[PDB]
Design a binder for this molecule. Structure first.
Ligand code: HEC
Ligand code: HEC
Ligand code: HEM
Ligand code: HEM
Lengths: 524, 185, 107, 218
């Protein structure tokens, strides 16, 4: 309404800065939405976690169930597990909400992994945005730790075993300090009365707040420093091509948020996750094949599994094997933020860049990325050895040996293969640059020859063979149908055609609009 | 150029191979049929004649509508082609629901796959036919989607025709199987 | 430095102080597993779990009650504990149940 | 009876004599002596399809009450545990089912869940053999298999475990698997590894498809 706008303008006088941000232009590409999905998942986690906190009770004093689940009546059990069972079974829809929460957390982990992979491939980690990369590494590490703390609050057999093994063994295995850290964390021996409340507090308060603040910082940094863009016809290192905020950008963001909430809700309602009632209350004497915790820290478990048993014995002391696992994970943590410094001091490049490079252009970085992803995949699949041997009748020892040897022998093979693959892609791009794109049509040539009949993409010489073009790092079509050759059939909807004049008018209007857009983009 | 169409002969030989597949299926069925004397069907089994004939009429009507679609196809009209193909697709979907309901009724009254040899062979013979009908529906969907995304060329008409007589072959093998089972017994 | 030291002083504990009584004085928790004799001659039975509430959680074990390939789980009994009737006895039984280094196999 | 048992075991030389001897002596090269195990061992090993192989479960060989003859023959040859029968001439089916569940569930999580699974599905062992799923298991064979001690499985005596304990165990086993999961479609009863696989194959694919539909490529 006019009166409200007039009052708002007269009070705070905001027009300039509002006009400044509202006229901002954002790049348009499908790969640029892989962060919005993670942010929307984060919003879902926050709202669900706000809901779940109203029915939980983190206490380790033993109690009796005497609730509604008959096969669990009259069993000594922890209070927190009783509260979790209450949320799962005695509240209308509570199980649905907690399943949504868990599925959303997995969504968040997968989204952050994919976004980091795309950032690493595009090579936007150069000089202008290195601190963003460091912040992203910190975000990944903190989110992974928070996710590890997630599935441990309902202290069932699975969570209890996982936390016991990981925390107790790693902390107690520290060479110098060792027992001090474990006793500080647990308050004495491993099974403590204060462990679960401390974990609950850390999962609700410190890590989520720090993560939200750091996410806001990252978003602010990407807001101020303008986003990059893929090379194209009307793209240069001193301008940004895209769409404005008001008519497109926010609306697409809201639609994507609704769609991601929809897929989360559907797949949460369809798939059962973490059936703690089928499990039992945690006791030190119960254990089984239940292992392989959540799939975003599964690499640590695989590394623990595959490591050979090397130990050192000197004067009344002993360093166990898992210390090597701790060293490896610490080095992996260290290398993630230190990569841009290593690259910039290795290649000797200190130039600004606002334009990315397509993956096939740079072979070395793609090869190193393939190195890392293959290593991660082989380590992750190693920890799932038991299910491999179960579903597929394979020897457990044979699979363990296969993983052990592959961790060393597979990486160089895929490294060399992807190097050759990138070189071949560059060669194919050069070849399609040299001649016209293949039309897939042959002619008899009555004198007795066969020709491809290349379609030139531009200037043609006196002989009819198109003159060679130049590579500008821009994608080019490899199929005739990618460019406009023959399309836009009749104006009917699904069964009945329309008037011919209307169809012709629509066709000419569309052709004129597309030609005008292309001419405006190319000339400017 | 290209007085014959290679798609035609390719589809012809593919349907020939599938016809030999159904020959193998018929070989499985007819075997051991004479091994049982008197009431060679198990008593816990009784075919519903009042429900088998309607699906056969459904399939033959669908085949006739497909032929009408072909007749629309050789001339320059895509919309009548789409209408006839949609009618055929709906008719086939109704048929598929028909044998699904028959399947649900049959197992509910005794005979199952591990129960008797006659039940096993009948189920095996009908299952491949149902799967091929579903594949034909998938082909209908793909072909009708392809029609509305670009211009009309003789290749589209060739694809429509080959799918059409693939459906006709399906109708022929189905009626042969029906005559073998519900009539000769 | 003073503020950070005071802030961090709420979590530091000594893992080597004698808190658990034994038959040779008092020892740290990490050196014990609940099987250490407490007054030099205690009789501890390899009581096995039962899983029932009315009946005692653990019952004594006889050598004849085994097989050539039997696997069983046992826990320390400490007869002075008593059956699970009183509050103190029940709490002690739960405490001996919740012990990481307690369970022992007998094959 | 006994003569028919000899006919169905030894004279039916397809089954017994080729691996254990006519007198149930036991050839040391292939199989065991088979002289101290009762009729229950034969009943379990035959009725569940664990027949002579070249050994996962398969179809049974003898079903037309001759399993009782084989059991009578082996029990006459040597003593051992016998099949629990209903008090009418048949095998007990529902009288074996107990009432208590908490004690049965605790016993399952203390001794049963270790190899098989938390939810009774298949379990993973080392160097070949594995833990079969309990879904195709029937209660009489469950009790008999526990009492018999098959390959790689710890033998359990009736002395160390009360009969009420077996009733509770089988009751819990039948309740856990046959009850509908109140969480929608089940995912094999394993840990979160299939959950992550499902996330990567469904959530990622749908999400990127919606992103491509909403977004544009340039
Ligand atoms: C060599 C082929 C073979 C034949 C023939 C054979 N079995 Fe077995 N079965 C074995 C072997 C080998 C074992 C030893 C343990 C194992 O492999 O599981 C065994 C185990 C058993 C067991 C359980 C283990 C034990 O100590 O009791 C029983 C009971 C048994 N056999 C009974 C029979 C009966 C009854 C027949 C006749 C129907 C038979 N066997 C014929 C292969 C055979
Ligand atoms: C890993 C050691 C192990 C333990 C512990 C164990 N089992 Fe077994 N059990 C096995 C193996 C191995 C088999 C299958 C052997 C075969 O198929 O030849 C088996 C067989 C069975 C079967 C038969 C399934 C079928 O289809 O025939 C059942 C039921 C069963 N176990 C349940 C139990 C129960 C009840 C307990 C607790 C008394 C238990 N498992 C504990 C090893 C074990
Ligand atoms: C939950 C965690 C994270 C979220 C929600 C998030 C979100 C985003 C979003 C929405 C963008 C802009 C759009 C886009 O790039 O697709 C972006 C850009 C960026 N992100 Fe993150 N991010 C996260 C973690 C990370 C990580 C792990 C890294 C490494 C990282 C480094 C970067 C960089 C360098 C950019 C700038 C891209 C450019 O300028 O072209 N961030 N982030
Ligand atoms: C920061 C990202 C977060 C991660 C990675 C995370 C991780 C997890 C995981 C894996 C679960 C198990 C879900 C389940 O068992 O169904 C869980 C449950 C829970 N989370 Fe979070 N969580 C996050 C944020 C939050 C927030 C913001 C809150 C609210 C303060 C919260 C409170 C809870 C509660 C109360 C539960 C119990 C529900 C349950 O376990 O079933 N979490 N969390």
């Amino acid at each position: 309404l006019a009166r409200q706008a007039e009052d708002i303008d007269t009070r705070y006088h905001p027009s300039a800065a509002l006009r400044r941000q509202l006229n901002k232009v954002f790049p348009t590409h499908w790969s640029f939405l892989l962060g919005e999905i993670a942010l929307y998942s984060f919003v879902v986690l926050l709202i669900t976690g706000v809901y779940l906190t109203l029915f939980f009770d983190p206490s380790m004093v033993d109690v009796t169930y005497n609730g509604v689940y008959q096969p669990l009546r009259g069993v000594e059990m922890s209070r927190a597990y009783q509260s979790a069972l209450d949320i799962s079974f005695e509240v209308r829809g509570g199980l649905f909400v907690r399943q949504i929460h868990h599925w959303a957390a997995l969504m968040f982990a997968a989204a952050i992994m994919v976004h980091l992979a795309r950032i690493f491939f595009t090579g936007a980690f150069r000089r202008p945005r290195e601190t963003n990369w460091v912040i992203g590494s910190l975000l990944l590490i903190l989110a992974m730790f928070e996710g590890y703390f997630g599935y441990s609050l309902p202290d069932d057999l699975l969570s209890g075993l996982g936390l016991r093994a990981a925390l107790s063994s790693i902390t107690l295995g520290m060479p110098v300090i060792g027992t001090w850290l474990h006793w500080a964390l647990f308050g004495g021996d491993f099974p403590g009365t204060i462990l679960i409340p401390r974990l609950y507090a850390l999962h609700i308060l410190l890590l989520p707040g720090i993560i939200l603040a750091l996410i806001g910082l990252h978003l602010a940094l990407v807001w101020f420093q303008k986003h990059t863009q893929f090379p194209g016809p009307g793209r240069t290192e001193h301008n940004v091509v895209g769409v404005r905020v008001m008519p497109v950008f926010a609306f697409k963001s809201g639609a994507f948020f609704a769609a991601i909430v929809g897929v989360l809700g559907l797949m949460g309602g369809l798939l059962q996750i973490n059936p703690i009632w089928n499990l039992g209350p945690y006791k030190p004497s119960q254990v089984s094949a239940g292992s392989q915790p959540d799939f975003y820290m599964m690499w640590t478990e695989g590394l623990a599994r595959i490591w050979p048993p090397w130990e050192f014995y000197f004067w009344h002391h002993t360093i166990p094997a898992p210390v090597w696992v701790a060293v490896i994970m610490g080095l992996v943590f260290v290398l993630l933020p230190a990569y841009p410094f290593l690259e910039k001091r290795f290649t000797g490049d200190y130039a600004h860049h606002n334009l990315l490079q397509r993956p096939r252009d740079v072979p070395v970085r793609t090869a190193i990325g393939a190195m890392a992803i293959a290593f991660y995949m082989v380590l992750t699949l190693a920890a799932m050895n038991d299910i491999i041997a179960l579903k597929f009748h394979i020897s457990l020892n044979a699979t363990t040996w296969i993983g052990r040897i592959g961790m060393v022998i597979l990486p160089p093979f895929v490294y060399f293969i992807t190097y050759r693959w990138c070189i071949g892609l560059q060669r194919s791009d050069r070849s399609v640059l040299e001649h016209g794109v293949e039309t897939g049509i042959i002619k008899r040539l009555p004198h007795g020859a066969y020709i491809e009949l290349h379609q030139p993409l531009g200037p043609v010489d006196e002989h009819g063979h198109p003159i060679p073009l130049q590579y500008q790092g821009a994608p080019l079509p490899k199929r005739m149908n990618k460019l406009g050759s023959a399309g836009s059939p009749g104006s009917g909807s699904f069964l009945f055609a329309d008037s011919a004049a209307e169809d012709a008018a629509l066709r000419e209007a569309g052709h004129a609009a597309e030609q005008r857009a292309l001419a405006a983009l190319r000339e400017h | 150029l290209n007085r014959p169409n290679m798609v035609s002969v390719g589809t012809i030989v593919w349907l020939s191979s599938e016809l030999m597949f159904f020959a193998g299926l018929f070989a499985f069925y007819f075997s051991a049929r004479a091994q049982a004397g008197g009431n060679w069907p198990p008593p816990p089994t009784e075919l519903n004649l009042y429900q088998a004939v309607p699906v056969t009429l459904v399939l033959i009507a669908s085949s006739f509508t497909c032929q009408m679609g072909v007749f629309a196809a050789e001339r320059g009209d895509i919309f009548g082609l789409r209408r006839w193909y949609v009618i055929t697709f709906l008719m086939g979907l109704f048929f598929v629901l028909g044998q699904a309901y028959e399947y649900r009724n049959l197992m509910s009254h005794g005979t199952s796959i591990p129960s008797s040899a006659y039940g096993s062979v009948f189920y095996l013979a009908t299952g491949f036919h149902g799967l091929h009908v579903t594949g034909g529906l998938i082909a209908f969907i793909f072909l009708l989607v392809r029609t509305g995304m670009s211009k009309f060329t003789p290749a589209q008409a060739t694809a429509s025709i080959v799918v059409s007589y693939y459906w006709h072959f399906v109708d022929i093998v189905w009626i042969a199987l029906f005559t073998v089972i519900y009539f000769i017994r | 430095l003073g503020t950070l030291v005071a802030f961090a002083g709420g979590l530091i504990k000594n893992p080597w102080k004698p808190v658990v009584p034994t038959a040779e004085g008092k020892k740290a928790v990490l050196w014990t597993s609940g099987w250490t004799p407490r007054y030099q001659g205690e009789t501890i039975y390899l009581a096995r779990a039962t899983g029932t509430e009315d009946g005692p959680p653990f019952i004594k074990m006889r050598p004849e009650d085994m097989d050539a390939g039997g696997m069983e789980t046992v826990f320390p009994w400490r007869e002075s504990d008593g059956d699970g009737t009183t509050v103190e006895s029940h709490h002690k039984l739960q405490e001996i149940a919740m012990g990481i280094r307690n369970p022992v196999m007998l094959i | 009876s006994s003569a028919l048992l000899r006919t169905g075991k030894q004279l039916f030389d397809t089954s017994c004599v080729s691996c254990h001897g006519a007198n149930l002596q036991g050839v040391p090269d292939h199989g065991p002596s088979l002289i101290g195990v009762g009729e229950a061992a034969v009943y379990f090993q035959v009725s569940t399809g664990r027949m002579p192989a070249m050994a996962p479960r398969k179809d049974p060989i003898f079903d037309e009450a001759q399993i009782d003859a084989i059991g009578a023959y082996v029990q006459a040859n040597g003593g051992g545990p016998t099949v629990v029968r209903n008090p009418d001439g048949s095998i007990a089916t529902q009288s074996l089912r107990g009432n208590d569940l908490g004690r049965g569930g605790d016993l399952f999580r203390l001794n049963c869940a270790s190899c098989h699974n938390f939810t009774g599905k298949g379990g993973a062992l080392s160097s070949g053999k594995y833990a079969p799923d309990l879904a195709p298991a029937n209660e009489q064979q469950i009790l008999t298999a526990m009492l018999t001690g098959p390959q790689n499985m710890p033998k359990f005596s009736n002395r160390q475990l009360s009969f009420e304990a077996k009733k509770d165990i089988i009751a819990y086993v039948k309740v856990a698997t046959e009850a509908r999961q109140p969480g929608g479609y089940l995912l094999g009863g394993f840990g979160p590894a299939p959950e992550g696989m499902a996330m990567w194959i469904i959530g990622m694919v749908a999400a990127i498809g919606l992103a491509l539909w909403i977004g544009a490529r340039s």
